[PDB]
Design a protein around this nucleic acid. Sequence first.
RNA 1: GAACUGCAUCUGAUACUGUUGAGCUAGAGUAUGUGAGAGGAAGGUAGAAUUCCAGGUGUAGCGGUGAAAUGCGUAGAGAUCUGGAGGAAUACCGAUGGCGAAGGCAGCCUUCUGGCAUAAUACUGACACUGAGGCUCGAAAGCGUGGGUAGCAAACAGGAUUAGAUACCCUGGUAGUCCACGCCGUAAACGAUGUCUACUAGUCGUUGGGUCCGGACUUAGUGACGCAGCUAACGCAAUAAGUA
RNA 2: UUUAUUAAAAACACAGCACUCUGCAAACACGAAAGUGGACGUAUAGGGUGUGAUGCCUGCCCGGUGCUGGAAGGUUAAUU
Lengths: 86, 56, 272, 102
Amino acid sequence: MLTNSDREQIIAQYQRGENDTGSPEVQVALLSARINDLQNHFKAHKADHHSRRGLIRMVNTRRKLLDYLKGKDLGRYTTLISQLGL
Amino acid sequence: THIDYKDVELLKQYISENGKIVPSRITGTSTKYQRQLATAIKQARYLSLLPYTDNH
Amino acid sequence: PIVKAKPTSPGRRFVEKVVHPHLYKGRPFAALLESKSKTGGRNNNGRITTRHIGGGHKQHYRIIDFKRTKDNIPATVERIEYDPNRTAHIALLKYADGERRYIIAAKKQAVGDTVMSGEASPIRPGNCLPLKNIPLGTVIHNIELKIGKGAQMARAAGASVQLLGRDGIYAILRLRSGETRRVHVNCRAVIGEVSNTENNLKSLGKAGASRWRGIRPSVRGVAMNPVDHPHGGGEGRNKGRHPTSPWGQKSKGLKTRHNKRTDSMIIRRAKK
Amino acid sequence: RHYEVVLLVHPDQSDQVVGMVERYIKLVQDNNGIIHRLEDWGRRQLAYPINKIHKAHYVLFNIETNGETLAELEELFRYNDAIIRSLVMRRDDAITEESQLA
RNA sequence: GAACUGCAUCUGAUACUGUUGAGCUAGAGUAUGUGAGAGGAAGGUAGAAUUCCAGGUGUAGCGGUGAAAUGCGUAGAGAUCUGGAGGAAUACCGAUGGCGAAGGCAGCCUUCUGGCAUAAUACUGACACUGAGGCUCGAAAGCGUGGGUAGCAAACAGGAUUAGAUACCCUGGUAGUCCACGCCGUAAACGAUGUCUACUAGUCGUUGGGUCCGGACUUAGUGACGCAGCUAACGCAAUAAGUA
RNA sequence: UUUAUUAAAAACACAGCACUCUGCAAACACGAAAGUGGACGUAUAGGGUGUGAUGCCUGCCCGGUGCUGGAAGGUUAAUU
């Protein structure tokens, strides 16, 4: 999983201000890193169905946040998914 | 306070003469500590610090 | 793994080939090669002494080091090749001093790893050890029967032996045939199971695929006349006789083992 | 990640236990490992007969190491033929004080 | 005359809905610290017990039933002791206890991993609820391929009981049950109670927290009662079947 | 594929399935033996037998004759 050291590094790169950690950009960035990290766990444990329900949840959460940005600030959205490759 | 599987002397009074874990309705220990009691005895049994049963 | 063929032809409808994309696509190491011509299952009298042999593709013989007498000299797996002479794959070894050899390939053995031989060797797939230096319970192959003679047992694709234990100067083994056997503890074995574990899983698909392998058609004995087979004879279809070979020997349970000098090397067999 | 490992050595092979412990000690200390505790409980009367013996030698030593070195340790214990039993734990903290058994 | 509920076009109003700009934190989320758990996946291992194989002691029964008989046993059973093989399940703990969306999940250990509970601060600022189609997961049985196979046991065989007994009971016993990878997509899959909100007497337990002074309070679960209210009645009753 | 020269087929073969044998000086086969094949292969291999892609499947009978296992008892060769 993601450690504290790198988790704070993604926040520091997607900061919308001083130690916010709550903006749609930082949340989507945190979910994106977490989702990609779990791709290694599910490659070795594909029968893990109870953990995968958790993975879908943050995939669903990330989609809801991206929908919110697209409706809120289009420029903030097209730029964010350019960095995250979504 | 705290419980470990190396408290063999302390684990003796929570196990019966034939080696079964005493239920909480007798000793009166808390549910939280009984769970820690059970796993510590289970580990001590594995290391041959406590008998599984009194005939082997 | 296996890959089914599309039914584009009736001859391709049940072709299920084993495919290994990790095995060498080039040619075998030239110096470890020998000319080898088909015999048609004929002996020095020119007589068919084993039927249904004849035909097939020309193939060289790869000289497999079944002995592994280069002890305490590490060798690295140069490449894993396909061998037409056997069902197992073969690893091209590359010894420190530059000498190159072929060995049977373990399933858990890739290109680049180092393989060891001798008595002070790690317990990893590929290493060749005397049966006393192998802990009980590990899965082995390439079992020696005589000391210094080379691997005899467990040499086919997917072959494996269970080292059950020791009872003195013998080593109790459990062969894939279900027979428990004792072997001198000074004999050698290789760690791991033999590669190409999905060989029995294949399907040739058509009569010509068996012709490519040197196998000729087989005629059932009840399709013959009584002058050719004990099963031959009859108006219409009929067996009439207890099942038997064309030489008059039962083929439905008659045990055929003559050895009385190796009878003490066999602990038991398995009933199922 | 801290680990608490307890070994069960055969009583006959208790003469090389000191050389057995240091072999793992040097292995852990080599790979940036810290030995927070080490004690020899000595010969102890087993609760039940393991492998047709009634007494055995107990060794406990809490260590800290990485996953790679722990895999090396577990392999050594299994192929040792003197360690008749072993128990590896994952401890959240580092334990240094002498255990109540010693 | 009235009406033809209508339709159209202008004008006015701005409480509500719609569309928009800015702002807010109370719904929903994020970061940080602790905690509990049979949550999931992969490996390893431990101890009882059954079965089988091989020996030692030993002799005439064992087994089974309401009775028997089939069966096993003088080729030495059953019982008892010592070894070996193997598979499956994990006694006690054990709990209207816990975890999980449901299905479900219990020896112990390591690795990978999901959610939840909890005090405070910081942050985003309605990002919410529900959801046709759709997709995912989904007990047991069953199917495909490949392994395994101790116990139990459909089918099947025999012994009984009976008028008969394709049963219940007895002795055996194969698929299955176990493992890997896939299908199946169904259960009284039930709380026979869709999900999410807010509000409405109280009492007594219990699980995981938290804060105070052995108690007190406050949370998130899980129960037993019991008002008002609801109900054909049974009964439900802050975990509603009450009020919306 | 086959009855060269009256039978080309539903016959044989066939991929696939099953049983069974075989631990390597393998079983099995040629041979008088040496020597060979099987095979410079090794139970995912090799032999024999039956059946004959595939789909759904494959019931009951071990009395006879085989085959496998067992030896309590009966009978039993040369020999002495």
